[PDB]
Amino acid sequence: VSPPPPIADEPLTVNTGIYLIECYSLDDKAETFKVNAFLSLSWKDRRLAFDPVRSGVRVKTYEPEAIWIPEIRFVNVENARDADVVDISVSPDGTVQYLERFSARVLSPLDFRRYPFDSQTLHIYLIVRSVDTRNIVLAVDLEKVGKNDDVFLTGWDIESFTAVVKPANFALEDRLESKLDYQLRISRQYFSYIPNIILPMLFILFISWTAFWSTSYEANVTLVVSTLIAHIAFNILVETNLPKTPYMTYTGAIIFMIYLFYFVAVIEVTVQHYLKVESQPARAASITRASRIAFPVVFLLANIILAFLFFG
Amino acid sequence: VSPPPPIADEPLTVNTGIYLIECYSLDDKAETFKVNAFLSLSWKDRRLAFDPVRSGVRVKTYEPEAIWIPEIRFVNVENARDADVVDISVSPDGTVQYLERFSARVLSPLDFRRYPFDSQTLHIYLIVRSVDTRNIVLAVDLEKVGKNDDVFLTGWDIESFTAVVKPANFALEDRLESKLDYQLRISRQYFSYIPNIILPMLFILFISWTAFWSTSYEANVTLVVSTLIAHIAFNILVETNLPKTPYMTYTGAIIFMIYLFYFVAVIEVTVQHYLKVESQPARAASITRASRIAFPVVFLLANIILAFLFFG
Amino acid sequence: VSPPPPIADEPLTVNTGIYLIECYSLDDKAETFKVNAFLSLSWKDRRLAFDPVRSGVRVKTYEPEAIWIPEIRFVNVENARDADVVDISVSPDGTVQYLERFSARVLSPLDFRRYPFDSQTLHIYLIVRSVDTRNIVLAVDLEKVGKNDDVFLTGWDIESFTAVVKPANFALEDRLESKLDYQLRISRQYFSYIPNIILPMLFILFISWTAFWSTSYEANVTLVVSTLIAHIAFNILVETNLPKTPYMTYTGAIIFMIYLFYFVAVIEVTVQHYLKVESQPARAASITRASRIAFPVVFLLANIILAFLFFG
Amino acid sequence: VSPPPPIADEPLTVNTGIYLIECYSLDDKAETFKVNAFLSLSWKDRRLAFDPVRSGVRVKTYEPEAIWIPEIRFVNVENARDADVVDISVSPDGTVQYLERFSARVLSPLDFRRYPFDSQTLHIYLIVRSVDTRNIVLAVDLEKVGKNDDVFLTGWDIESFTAVVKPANFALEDRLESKLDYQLRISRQYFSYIPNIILPMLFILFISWTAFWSTSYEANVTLVVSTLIAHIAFNILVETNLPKTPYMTYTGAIIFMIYLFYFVAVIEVTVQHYLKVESQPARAASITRASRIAFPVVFLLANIILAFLFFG
Amino acid sequence: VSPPPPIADEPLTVNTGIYLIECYSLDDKAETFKVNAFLSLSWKDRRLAFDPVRSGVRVKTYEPEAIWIPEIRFVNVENARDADVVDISVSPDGTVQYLERFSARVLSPLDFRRYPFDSQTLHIYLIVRSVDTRNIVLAVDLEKVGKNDDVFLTGWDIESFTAVVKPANFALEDRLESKLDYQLRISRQYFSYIPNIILPMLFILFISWTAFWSTSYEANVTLVVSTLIAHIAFNILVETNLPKTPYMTYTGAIIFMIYLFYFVAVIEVTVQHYLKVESQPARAASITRASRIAFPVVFLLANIILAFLFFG
């Protein structure tokens, strides 16, 4: 088949719409995610009507090798999509309707700062090949684009799914400047993360801090060092689900602060024991009474400062 | 070949039946599972008989490129199934029998709350393409649908395998409203999970609780903190088989409760030691006698409350 | 080409033989294993001789698209095998010889109870398609079936490789009842498992038991709890190679027994310390003298009972 | 189609240009990396003009099966690239422009010494097949080669992207000596590595060193050995992201030095305790006062020597 | 096309040569390795010259579908190789030159005893299909076979790359007895393994042995048991890179010996404490003085015996 011939130099407008079905496999190390969805195409096909007789008002059904199907390519994909044509129904007026299912892998960038309370935005880009009959300009219709409201992407909630028109902005472009940008906004559910991670760390830190009400040097050493070992083990456990991040993060800053606090506690215990051995009990008592109030207040202030710095 | 022509506007009814062979690879992180099974198709083929002579009562054998094979697509799959035609035998009356083997990947949602005692339900959806001769409506026959009763899906037991008819409920539909829903019910075998997980945790918790019959502060500290380290290590071991779950779970609630109990035990030991140092032995003795009864009763009540909350 | 026409209603007998080459990748979580082997086919081809002249006694060489190659399908495979025809030589008498190499994935069930001393049996099923000329019945010849005696499946030893005839036993069958069952028996080499796993656990348990010859409560607590931590760490190390098993196992029973023994030892130490504090040294001495003989004998008896229960 | 015939024995010069789009999946164990990019081809096509009429100054659009597309193969790839032709536009003058998108896997060597502060250089090699019309020599144009400046390769920064001409230097070559070498320079961002790895190790080492201000043998033993256990656990945590390296590395040297320092500290503590037991307190006091200054200075000098050795 | 006809019953000799390019992905669990290399073919093609005119001394260039390309199959591969023809140049004399690039997966057996100082030998087998014109016998030429001397297989060094002729030795053979065996010898670089594994284990063992110069039972117990825990953790760390080996190994024997030494040290400490409690200090002093010399000498002798046993 051949593309429709021009009529009055009117640009060929193709209305594109993506209907989401399933979103899954949000890989973080590879920064990829697999998507399975539909695709709706509807282009003007005047001067090439298919039996427009009023007595033949029945919807015309055709095959892929019957008329010119426009060629649309995805930019940020690893390979060509698996096209699965479902139905091709065209009204006798001339408007063609096309539906298919595809499952491709999309390359989109992900930022994991503000990890426990982050929001992501996925992008899908579409490019239509040029033709020798008349330039084709992509248009977005708000009726076909949408989602089934049953996306099984666990751990995230979908806020919106829109599409706009943007220039190609490619150094190798010649005439194509009508790419499409589909934006999907998701938000992470952070309810379980608090009891899963934050509270046990605070409990271990408080258990370590309980050494300021004691005097036995051996008991204090055992408490502090064993709590440090427990903290290291819990960090090893936490690192299993956390993705590899080659930049600073809120959780990493918190962990570093906890390490610093453990070091300061060790120093304080050593100083207290040294003073007690050197037989200056008044200074040791004053230091150990001051630390009980000094540590929690400084910890809270540092946490507030870090939260303000990382969340505006 | 071409689809059979209409006769008296009677809708073409296709009887579909899936015969399970092997179910395996129940991936939880991807929320997928691979299935290998048969597929039986039988559609009315009147006015296109194949030598209906009584002397030719022998069963007719044909090839895939001999007659019109109906096109059936799966909705919740990553890609097209691997069709492997086994036999195509049609009686001289006109009824056609079709059998094939396929191995596709199915996308079905899985809930892991009530994890150790959960029950899952897998869904498979079928859609038949429309044709220009007469609308095709899917029908389910109870004879062909079934299982070999030798499914090697370890860790689960199959209760039933039924199929019903449901509307398409798609925003892009035009006339298709005859999707099929195959429901597979499975139940997890929880016998080994008790000795594998629950009992060692209780043993470690009781070992930690054995510190209420002692008076040595160093011994109590060693017991409690080392049992905390052992609990963390056992949690790390348990997390290997548990799937990633971005929501609350019964096991997670139990683990959080155990952490809270460890923290409370540390606080109680510290208070007892502080009282003994401050030379008020009566209060310390009363507290340490009360705790022996207080801890197990509160633990049992909390476990009962959690079980009632998570299991209706 | 076309299948040979019938002569005197004699069923077409096809002699099948599988020659193993390489067996590898015995996946346990997926319960699969990849096999690379040969395949020998020899069927009667009378009335379709290929130059049976005595002066042309030279062996005839043909291509896959020269004569009718029988179609054989594997039942317990994920997808169609990769057929690689090596040679097709047919004698002038009429007997055809066919050889090819394939590498498919086989789905076979594996039982891991009696794990360290278990024996497995792999099954491969073959089905021949029916034809419209004369029913084909599969036959097994003992000359072509065999192995190269150089199977590189490490950790296992091959005992036998036989094949028998069994009914199809399928609910969807029509006339096919001549499936083939190839049985491969393997045995696990358990020599290294003893020094790799069993002996260190016994050493740690004995180190824990060395606390019955001491009196220091702090030393006994340290010994027992630190040995418990070491046991947990060693269990974590062991779990790396052990496959996921959703049912009871000999090793799991042994580990549970070890946990129970640790708990009993903790209870005994606590009771001894409580008696010593309450100033009844005779009873404590009697208990600590009795335990030294009680623990090893009970451990040995329990191990004997478990071995008898799990090994008939 | 056929390649253009020669005119005046002038070698056919093909201008090649690669436009990067996405670089990702820098696998270290396999020493591979996947690249998705464009490819620009422009070759002289005189004597085969495509309607050079001035009134037909419109850009000519063709298909892959319209003219001779030069064949270019990649040397260091696992398999053939996935060619995805985007547009083929040729001016009426005779110059042809070709654009396509490919996603292949490149085999390039990676050196991980100087790991935290290393710089890598990736290579891509191109070879053009010989033809029977006239020898083809590859040329590099500086306009088409480039990058989109939006490479999402996290953890690295791109410095330059150039290309040069080099001899084939193959033992099997006959006449081809015009391979192309595309060099991509990247640098690792080392900011987060310092707080993620280096500082906690120093904190643990200092905590271990705090035992020189004490006299309790049990407390010193507990401190040193528990810090050794914590160091081993932290090394286990660090090894998760570090790639497998079968040669010496800066981090490995640092870890070995830390182990040696722990051993020396254990020896010093044992010697001090032995002297105190043997009742020579002056020597023990002198040794424990000297060690406080000896250890940090030696550690700093050793670190400086290692840094100078590994960084010129 | 058709194979060349026979001339004087002279066997067709094909000179084969493999030129290595990249060797990588030496998987140990699967016992496989991927290889990317060239392949040179040169067979006698007399009586089918391609314009042998002296004025046409120019090298003839052809396509794969121009002449008979001999069929060569690999025996120990999972699937057919990815053939990528580079150039087909034939001199007017009659000798044909063929070059291509392939990337297949090879199944070769690997022995990991003597692991840290082992040497491997990889094998590649080639089989040529028989033809009905004249028997083909494979020959090896020493000029085309070779390597680029730039193999990026890290951790190994290539010593030689030769090829010989061997009989097929297959039970299903008919006339083919001319298989080719390509042997690749590699040696592991063991420099980094010593500081990465061996020395920390010796340091931990010596730290454990430092308990023979002390008398505090609690300190000795803490030292020995905590060093045992550290040894278990280090073994867990080591097991990450070590491949799964279902047979005895030098490293496994060393680890078992270390466990036995830890057990003996625990027994000695317990005996010394029991004697001191029973008030026989002379015997305890004699035992603890003897052990200091007994342990290192026995350890060295056992290591020497193990090395002699495992290395001839």
Residue numbers in the entry:
A (entry chain C), B (entry chain D), C (entry chain E), D (entry chain B), E (entry chain A): 5 to 316
Please, what does the article write about this entry?
Gloeobacter violaceus proton-gated ion channel (GLIC), a prokaryotic model of pLGICs, is particularly well-suited to stabilize preactive states under suboptimal activating conditions modulated by pH. The GLIC homomer consists of five subunits, each with an ECD and TMD. GLIC is activated by the protonation of a series of titratable residues in the ECD, leading to counterclockwise rotation and contraction of the ECD. Therefore, we established a data processing strategy involving symmetry expansion, backtracking particles, supervised particle reorientation, and 3D reconstruction to resolve high-resolution maps of various asymmetric intermediate states of nanodisc-reconstituted GLIC at pH 4.0, which provide comprehensive understanding of activation mechanism of GLIC.
